[PDB]
From Swiss-Prot, chain A:
Gene: SMC6
Job of this protein: Acts in a DNA repair pathway for removal of UV-induced DNA damage that is distinct from classical nucleotide excision repair and in repair of ionizing radiation damage. Functions in homologous recombination repair of DNA double strand breaks and in recovery of stalled replication forks. Probably plays a role in structure.
Cellular compartments annotated: Nucleus; Chromosome
The family this protein is said to belong to: Belongs to the SMC family. SMC6 subfamily.
Upper lineage: Eukaryota, Fungi, Dikarya, Ascomycota, Saccharomycotina
Subunit-structure text: Component of the Smc5-Smc6 complex which consists of KRE29, MMS21, NSE1, NSE3, NSE4, NSE5, SMC5 and SMC6.
Origin species: Saccharomyces cerevisiae (strain ATCC 204508 / S288c) (Baker's yeast)
Domain remark in the UniProt entry: The flexible hinge domain, which separates the large intramolecular coiled coil regions, allows the heterotypic interaction with the corresponding domain of SMC5, forming a V-shaped heterodimer.
Record's protein name: Structural maintenance of chromosomes protein 6
Shown stretch of the complete protein: 922 to 969 of 1114
Disulfide bridges in this chain: none
Additional comment: Present with 339 molecules/cell in log phase SD medium.
Swiss-Prot record, chain B:
Protein's UniProt name: DNA repair protein KRE29
Role played: Acts in a DNA repair pathway for removal of UV-induced DNA damage that is distinct from classical nucleotide excision repair and in repair of ionizing radiation damage. Functions in homologous recombination repair of DNA double strand breaks and in recovery of stalled replication forks.
Subunit description: Component of the Smc5-Smc6 complex which consists of KRE29, MMS21, NSE1, NSE3, NSE4, NSE5, SMC5 and SMC6. Interacts with NSE5.
Parent-record interval covered: 156 to 207 of 464
Record's subcellular location: Nucleus; Cytoplasm
Gene designation: KRE29
Organism: Saccharomyces cerevisiae (strain ATCC 204508 / S288c)
């Protein structure tokens, strides 16, 4: 039972760190998407 | 833990709820409307807010 | 709204349009900007060219 409860502790820690990474990557991806759209519009205007 | 899709889910949902239209309203229209974030093309002064 | 009136006319030799463009090129970076800056740059260039 001690091994299994320690297994759950490490499982929950890995779960929380995975969600932290997932939020970080999703936030970065959304910011990059919006920035890319803005940069595309800016480049099209400048080229024209 | 993961319950929302960016911030579009709440915006798309609550645009869908107050839509005053009896038709299909494909999700692609809601997605393109609620994901502007650059221009205010879809936000404007609407004097008429109910079906004629 | 301003452009085309008696106060701010189209033309290449107006001082006000040159000052506006001078400020727009000051802020404009073309890498991470608001699109309105590039739109203003293009519109001001077009209005400067209009005789």
């Amino acid at each position: 039972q001690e091994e299994v409860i320690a297994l759950f502790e490490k499982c929950r820690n890995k779960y929380k760190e995975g969600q932290k990474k997932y939020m970080e990557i999703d936030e970065a991806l959304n910011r990059l998407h919006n920035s890319l759209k803005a940069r595309d519009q800016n480049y099209k205007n400048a080229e024209k | 833990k993961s319950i929302v899709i960016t911030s579009n889910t709440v915006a798309k949902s609550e645009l869908q709820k107050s839509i005053k239209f009896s038709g299909s309203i494909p999700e692609i229209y809601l997605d393109v409307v609620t994901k502007e974030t650059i221009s205010d093309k879809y936000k404007d002064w609407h004097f008429i807010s109910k079906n004629c | 709204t301003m452009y085309g009136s008696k106060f701010i006319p189209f033309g290449p030799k107006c001082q006000v349009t040159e000052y506006f463009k001078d400020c727009i090129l000051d802020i404009s970076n073309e890498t991470t900007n608001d699109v309105e800056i590039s739109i203003l740059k293009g519109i001001l260039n077009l209005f400067s060219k209009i005789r």
